[PDB]
Design a protein around this nucleic acid. Structure first.
Length: 850
DNA sequence: TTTTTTTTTT
């Protein structure tokens, strides 16, 4: 027990908080209290019972619009422009099986279509059953949902199949993604949507009565959502015989899904392309004849049994060179430089997509490609058009990366794994695949997750292979030996095994599945129950579950919000404490991403501007809200895309960040926590310029994540989390390297690792804020000097009667919080509950340092 | 002194 700074408050100010809390304690309608107790009362069978008669709308169909529409395409499938595709999309592999697949679903509730890309499973399999449904006179019975892993896919596929039916978007074809939609007609419709839309909709339709048939696409990539989804239909389908499911997969361990539903009918469907042929690096340096210069027992246990088998098909110095390991992978960047320098002379016109693990090495091969020191490269410098591709760089949102190059120019793209699925570039005939990328890896023991460079898996090299295909024959240069391919895993660790489960075990209670261990162990891969429990314990600590593990009324509010519970709780507190707009900003950035790019060479000069937008508040999260305020003031000032370029920000990210804030705003007003659904509305923001208060609500979200700084000196810091480990601020964070902070304590959303240990994001907090909103407060005395602690961890001194008033104020803040969850209502500014709020504002305001 | 990547109703 070593003690810190002094939080005591003047006695004149405590006499005033004491009068407001005696005021609050003389206080003497709820549908929500009912719907909560209604849900704890009910078991799973009446749960299934009651929800049946609620969503009946697909029990009803409309004979005449059935009749009208089946004559309406039935007549004009012979007047001509449509049926140029009725002929032209039997081009694509899937429509050989149109009737084969129709019959299959008629006799099967769940089927599996395996196909590789270009077959058109998702383009058409939906329209085969709608045009079938319409043709038999079933039109209004039929409403089909087709789920996709990413947003842009859902839009593009919808907008493209829309246009194939000579309909504008919004008639028989639609898409719905979060906070953006073109909804199709309610019946005889095709709706594409992200996997997460349909899980949120499960809360109001747990047994999926509002769709006739569901199609789950790209399950082979094992997103959490699709794994969850087929997990919940083993519960859902028993009670819905007439619901039809169509699984859709690439051929990537296709038969896991076939085995997970009984042994399911499976449709294998043709690929479309020419080849893109594999060369491994024993083929690459057969042709490049490069050499290098500026663990080993296994490399050598791996390589030589296999060079003893390829002995005659290559020269002795090429098989000699599988034995330096830095041959394979990214270990030499001048090697890959000389391969792109190499493909430019030989091989016909075409694009080079180069896959490297991460952003550091996309820079170094960028620098080598545009600033070659070798006279062989200085030739090519200006006859290559070089694009960095990364989540954090601008080139992914412009149209240039997808373009054809200037005549006489050859386009080279140096990309992370983003180019495998997320981003698609159609003119690539050449892919160079390092085989190395980066992956989150966590150690449940240490509470460290680190970001480590890893080998890819077979499943990925085969899809980067495909990327070199779609326009004419490509070739795929993989920089590892074939001996290395046989040792990689089939597919990457499915994400549910590496995910925080806080949000899912909680949301699962709305579907009335209250044993996580029972249910989550029924998925294709069962999460480790120590993750399941480490999730249960975090929701018991923010008190979304009581200590029996049962949903509390605050938990039921947070399960409904589309954000992690920690941050859902932070949104709710910001409604009660009247800073709605700042805090939703923080919340929105943490569950999504920061608006800031970091283009190459501007690392130096994207960190000035993050600092100028922090306004010396040394809060990563309010720095984003400052940026957001700046972004609409550019939309009123109409300084528009000027503004977004000066400051290196994503037009598209801010569009979404601002749309989520109104989503949070709109649900809290629906939930009767706010009087206005406008998140900038005055009544919701009257504390929004009080910075000490905003860090208290920020700490109220990220608690218990805390760090302390003992160092003065840019500067170097000596810092520790509550975990005991020594930490520093990530360099991308704004609190990296400064000095003279007004508080020695910080809260953080995520701590992750390369070279040290880092906090990716932080806000300086004052000790008093943590006392009020945290836990682990006891009063006592250390030597003989009086103390008040937080988390039983950071012990600060305290006066005794500041102690009792905060302790009694935490007791009143807790019971107010519990009633506010049970009986949602906005706090009116003149009521009794508001004088408990004023009491906290006044205590927190003492930390404005003037 | 650093940056794998998705994504959430009415």
């Amino acid at each position: 027990i070593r003690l810190g700074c002094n939080v005591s408050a003047p006695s004149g100010v405590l006499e005033r908080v004491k009068e407001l809390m005696e005021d609050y304690s003389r206080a003497p309608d709820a549908k929500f209290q009912q719907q909560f107790r209604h849900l704890l009362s009910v078991n799973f069978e009446e749960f299934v019972a009651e929800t049946k008669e609620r969503n009946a709308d697909l029990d009803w169909v409309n004979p005449k619009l059935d009749e009208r529409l089946q004559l309406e395409l039935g007549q004009r499938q012979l007047e001509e422009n449509a049926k140029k595709r009725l002929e032209a999309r039997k081009k694509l592999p899937t429509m050989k099986y149109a009737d084969d697949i129709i019959q299959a679903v008629r006799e099967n509730q769940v089927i599996l279509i395996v196909g590789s890309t270009g077959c058109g499973k998702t383009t058409q399999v939906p329209q085969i059953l709608l045009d079938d449904a319409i043709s038999r006179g079933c039109a209004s019975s039929c409403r089909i949902i087709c789920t996709q892993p990413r947003r842009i896919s859902a839009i593009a596929i919808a907008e493209w199949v829309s246009y194939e039916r000579c309909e504008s978007l919004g008639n028989s074809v639609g898409y719905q993604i979060r906070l953006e939609s073109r909804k199709a007609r309610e019946r005889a419709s095709i709706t594409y949507c992200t996997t997460g839309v349909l899980l949120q909709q499960l809360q109001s339709d747990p047994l999926m009565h509002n769709l006739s048939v569901l199609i789950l696409d790209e399950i082979h990539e094992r997103s959490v959502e699709t794994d969850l989804l087929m997990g919940l239909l083993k519960v859902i389908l028993p009670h819905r015989p007439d619901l039809k499911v169509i699984l859709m997969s690439a051929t990537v361990r296709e038969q896991d899904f076939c085995d997970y539903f009984n042994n399911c009918p499976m449709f294998r469907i043709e690929g479309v392309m020419f080849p893109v042929k594999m060369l491994y690096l024993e083929d690459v340096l057969s042709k490049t004849n490069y050499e290098f210069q500026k663990r080993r027992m296994k490399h050598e246990a791996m390589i030589e049994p296999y060079l003893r088998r390829i002995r005659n098909s290559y020269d002795s110095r090429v098989l000699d060179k599988l034995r330096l390991p830095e041959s394979e992978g990214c270990e030499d960047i001048d090697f890959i430089a000389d391969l792109v320098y190499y493909i430019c002379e030989n091989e016909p016109e075409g694009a080079i997509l180069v896959f490297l693990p991460g952003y550091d090495k996309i820079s170094q091969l960028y620098n080598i490609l545009d600033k070659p020191k070798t006279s062989k490269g200085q030739r090519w410098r200006d006859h290559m058009a070089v694009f960095p591709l990364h989540s954090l760089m601008q080139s992914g949102e412009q149209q240039a990366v997808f373009r054809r190059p200037p005549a006489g120019q050859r386009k080279v793209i140096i990309s992370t794994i983003i180019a495998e699925t997320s981003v698609t570039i159609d003119d690539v005939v050449y892919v160079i695949n390092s085989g190395r990328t980066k992956a989150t890896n966590y150690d449940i023991e240490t509470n460290i997750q680190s970001l480590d460079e890893v080998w890819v898996t077979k499943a990925n090299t085969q899809q980067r292979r495909g990327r070199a295909g779609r326009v004419r024959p490509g070739i795929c240069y993989n920089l590892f030996s074939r001996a290395r391919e046989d040792r990689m895993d089939d597919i990457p660790t499915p994400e549910i095994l590496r995910s925080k489960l806080e949000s899912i075990i909680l949301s699962l209670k709305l579907l009335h599945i209250d044993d996580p261990y029972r249910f989550l162990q029924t998925l294709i891969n069962a999460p480790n129950p120590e993750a399941i429990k480490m999730g249960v314990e975090l929701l018991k600590r923010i008190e979304a579950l009581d200590q029996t593990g049962t949903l509390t009324p605050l938990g039921m509010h947070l399960a409904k919000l589309p954000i992690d519970p920690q941050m859902g709780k932070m949104i709710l507190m910001s409604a009660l404490f009247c800073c709605l707009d700042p805090i939703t900003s923080a919340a929105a950035a943490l569950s999504f991403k920061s608006p800031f790019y970091s283009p190459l060479g501007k690392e130096s000069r994207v960190d000035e501007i993050k600092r100028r937008m922090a306004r010396n508040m040394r809060s990563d999260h309010l720095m984003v809200h400052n940026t957001i305020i700046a972004y609409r003031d550019s939309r009123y000032s109409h300084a528009e895309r000027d503004f977004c370029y000066k400051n290196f920000l994503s037009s598209m990210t801010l569009q979404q960040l601002e749309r989520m804030k109104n989503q949070f705003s709109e649900l809290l007003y629906n939930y009767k926590f706010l009087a206005s659904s406008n998140c900038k509305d005055a009544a919701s923001n009257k504390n929004s310029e009080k910075i000490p208060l905003l860090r208290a609500i920020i700490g109220a979200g990220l608690y218990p994540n805390m760090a302390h700084l003992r160092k003065s000196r840019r500067a170097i810091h000596t810092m520790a989390t509550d975990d005991g480990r020594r930490v520093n601020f990530h360099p991308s964070s704004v609190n990296s390297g400064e000095s003279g902070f007004d508080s020695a304590y910080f809260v953080y959303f995520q701590r992750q690792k390369s070279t040290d240990l880092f906090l990716l994001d932080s806000t300086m907090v004052f000790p008093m804020a943590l006392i009020i909103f945290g836990d682990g407060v006891e009063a006592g005395v250390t030597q003989n000097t009086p103390y008040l602690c937080v988390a039983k961890t950071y012990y600060f001194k305290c006066n005794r009667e500041t102690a009792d008033v905060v302790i009694q104020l935490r007791s009143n803040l807790e019971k107010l919080l519990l009633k506010k969850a049970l009986y949602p209502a906005p706090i009116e500014e003149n009521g009794y509950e508001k004088q408990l709020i004023k009491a906290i504002e006044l205590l927190l305001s003492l930390d404005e340092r003037l």
